[PDB]
Amino acid sequence: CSPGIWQLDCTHLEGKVILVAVHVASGYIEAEVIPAETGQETAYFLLKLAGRWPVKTVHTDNGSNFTSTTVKAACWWAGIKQEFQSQGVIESMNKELKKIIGQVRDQAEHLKTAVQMAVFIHNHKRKGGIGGYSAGERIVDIIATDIQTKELQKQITKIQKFRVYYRDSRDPVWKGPAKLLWKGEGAVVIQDNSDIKVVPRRKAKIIRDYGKQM
Amino acid sequence: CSPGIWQLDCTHLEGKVILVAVHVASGYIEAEVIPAETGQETAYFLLKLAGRWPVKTVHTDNGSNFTSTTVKAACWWAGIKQENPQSQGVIESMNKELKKIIGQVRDQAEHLKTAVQMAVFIHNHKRKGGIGGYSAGERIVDIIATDIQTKELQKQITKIQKFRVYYRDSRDPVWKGPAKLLWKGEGAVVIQDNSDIKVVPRRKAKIIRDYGKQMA
């Protein structure tokens, strides 16, 4: 739901403009200084960005890079789909980054260096007492949760699909198929959507094979 | 100790050289083709690298940019540190491998440099049949994930180590030694004589924080 959704902010800068990227949840940013701003320049960055983190889609604030044919072309290479107070605050988070580049501006002669550094700052950035909650942890845990979510969901999908049929004890009629909570050789646990029940394996019936979508 | 370390190689192609930045264990790779190769140029990518993921260290027996100070300096602003022989050999093979990959990408792509960025996306995004991991890029998030949990837990051991508890045993008998609590069960104590692994009732054992003037 929340994953794979990132937000990109254009930067109008002294000298060269730059563009910054964040999964709104991750908090990570991979902003680059742009030697020249072009819909065609944008893409190469997007190409790199996609490798480090898969993004299903990115909402865009500005039509002009999206209008640029180049941009769209990359979204199809990737499979990334361009999408048509919080962001004004994220712009203020980028402003904070600008202020960060400012807090480091004196430190650095090359602005581009200051920006990447700034990125290193948002990253690995604790808030007050650290309390874990690492900005650096970003959604990286959410990535893992998603990876696991993928696995679990997979074993899950095989079960959700399957149908197991049980017959009420002392009832000629056999109850309609339902998802099964547990499998044992001696016994099995299952849940009717309406009610949840556990039954003897000898009492238990199951349908092993179905195959589609290659 | 291994996750922090990453390995970077740059191999010239058609004269122009790309900079390549793999995380060794994951094998996840980020490479930036450099318009010009300079130590300063090397560093900027390095800067980026540190932002994308922390790298404890990287090794080159000799680097021209490595010899160049600026690069090292950055490593120090990073706190990253410049420096299994068989894998290291494989790494040069990995450098070569991507080029082969690239050869296929070129008939596909308009500009080679743009083509290279794609080749890497493919390598990282590519399952490898999912054999090392369902994705090699996936292996990285995991390794990082394990570490995260490891660090908090490691810290758990640091906080735990500090606690100091003694054991009554029978009240009349004295208690021979200091104990480090393995776990706290309410109404109970989970402790370990380094020599022996044991557990006992809460009332029997009183727990005293070792600390004096901790920042907590």
Ligand SMILES: Cc1nc2ccccc2c(-c2ccc3c(c2)CCCO3)c1[C@H](OC(C)(C)C)C(=O)O
């Ligand atoms: C110059 C150029 N002109 C274009 C004009 C119209 C539409 C697309 C492009 C692309 C392009 C964009 C995305 C992309 C790929 C190619 C190729 C596959 C990945 O997605 C490029 C490419 O150049 C940039 C990457 C700098 C934009 C290129 O040819 O290498």
Ligand SMILES: Cc1nc2ccccc2c(-c2ccc3c(c2)CCCO3)c1[C@H](OC(C)(C)C)C(=O)O
């Ligand atoms: C031009 C330049 N010249 C140097 C000469 C000697 C030593 C360091 C530098 C640094 C530099 C490198 C790493 C770094 C910081 C600064 C500042 C702190 C973080 O690490 C830069 C920087 O520029 C490059 C990154 C392109 C090399 C800069 O913009 O200041």
